[PDB]
Amino acid sequence: NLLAGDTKEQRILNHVLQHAEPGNAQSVLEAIDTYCEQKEWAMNVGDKKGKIVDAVIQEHQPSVLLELGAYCGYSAVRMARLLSPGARLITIEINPDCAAITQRMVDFAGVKDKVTLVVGASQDIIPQLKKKYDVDTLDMVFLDHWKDRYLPDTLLLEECGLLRKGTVLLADNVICPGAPDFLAHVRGSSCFECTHYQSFLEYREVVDGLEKAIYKGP
Ligand SMILES: C[S@@+](CC[C@H](N)C(=O)[O-])C[C@H]1O[C@@H](n2cnc3c(N)ncnc32)[C@H](O)[C@@H]1O
Ligand SMILES: O=c1ccn(-c2cccc(-c3ccccc3)c2)cc1O
Ligand SMILES: [Mg+2]
């Protein structure tokens, strides 16, 4: 049932629970995007950049996906709705209140079986993925957490043997606000082949973009 509606996050979940079709992931995405366009801005990847994320998944067909930063579960629902039977999205969220919302959002959208939500800091969890979460390597990683953590987490994923030839990294917000150290690293390194996707900041007319970086191997 409903939450108190004290926080933006509770009000976003409440709006979905009251105003979206249960079990319909598309209806859920639309309800979040409408509310956030109309009522309260929120840091979801949103519909325009969401379309780019969709395209990346459609092209590369990942089965093992990792997301860094879940928030209210918008991108988790967005990516999971596209996955084939037996695909797995692991999503990491440091804030326990946000994680609780994300699980409710995932369940409501009908994609619970595809999602493994992990409460904790990416730098603590990423070392554990192989041994604790039965990961071999990752097919795709969506980076959309604190932007100063894009670089250290990418290096950590590599250090932990989670990246293979062909692993797709996709990073939100490489323009607004930017993650220049990450961007310099992936573009400058022969270990990554990069593609830039210019777009717009969620719910705004501000220019933004994502970067796709395909790992070439060490
Ligand atoms: C931009 S929001 C996530 C938006 C979500 N990807 C979407 O599009 O719907 C960023 C989130 O990352 C979480 N976060 C920041 N740093 C993190 C870290 N090191 N590990 C795990 N989560 C982190 C924050 O608590 C916040 O909820
Ligand atoms: O994941 C994200 C974290 C922060 N911002 C973010 C960072 C800095 C500014 C703004 C912003 C700018 C103008 C209007 C509204 C928000 C938004 C955007 C994201 O997609
Ligand atoms: Mg973002």
Q: Whose CA is nearest to atom 20 of ligand 2?
A: 43
Q: How far is the CA of 175 from the centre of ligand 2 (A)?
A: 10
Provide the 3-class DSSP secondary structure of residue 66: strand
- Tell me the structure's resolution in angstroms, rounded to a single decimal: 1.8
Q: How far is the CA of 152 from the centre of ligand 2 (A)?
A: 20
How many residues are present in the chain?
Answer: 218
**Please, are residues 199 and 47 in contact by the beta-carbon 8 Å criterion?**
no
**Please, are residues 79 and 56 in contact by the beta-carbon 8 Å criterion?**
no
Q: Tell me the backbone φ, ψ of residue 145, rounded to 5 degrees.
A: -105, -155
33, 172, 208, 211: the active-site residue: 172
Sign of CA dihedral 187, 192, 198, 200: negative
Please spell the DSSP secondary structure of the chain, one letter per residue.
Answer: ------SHHHHHHHHHHHHS-TT-HHHHHHHHHHHHHHT------HHHHHHHHHHHHHHH--SEEEEE--TTSHHHHHHHTTPPTT-EEEEEES-HHHHHHHHHHHHHTT-GGGEEEEES-HHHHGGGHHHHH--S--SEEEE-S-GGGHHHHHHHHHHTT---TTPEEEES-TTTT--HHHHHHHHH-TTEEEEEEEEE-TTSSSEEEEEEEEE---
9, 33, 153, 202: the active-site residue: 202
Numbered residues of the known binding site: 45, 67, 75, 93-94, 120-123, 144, 147, 172-173, 202
Enumerate domains of the chain plus CATH numbers.
Answer: 1-218 (3.40.50.150)
Amino acid sitting at position 146? W
Closest CA to 66 of 169, 174, 218, 192: 169
59 assigned to active site: no
The tokens of 68 are what?
């860094």
Q: How far is the CA of 31 from the centre of ligand 2 (A)?
A: 20
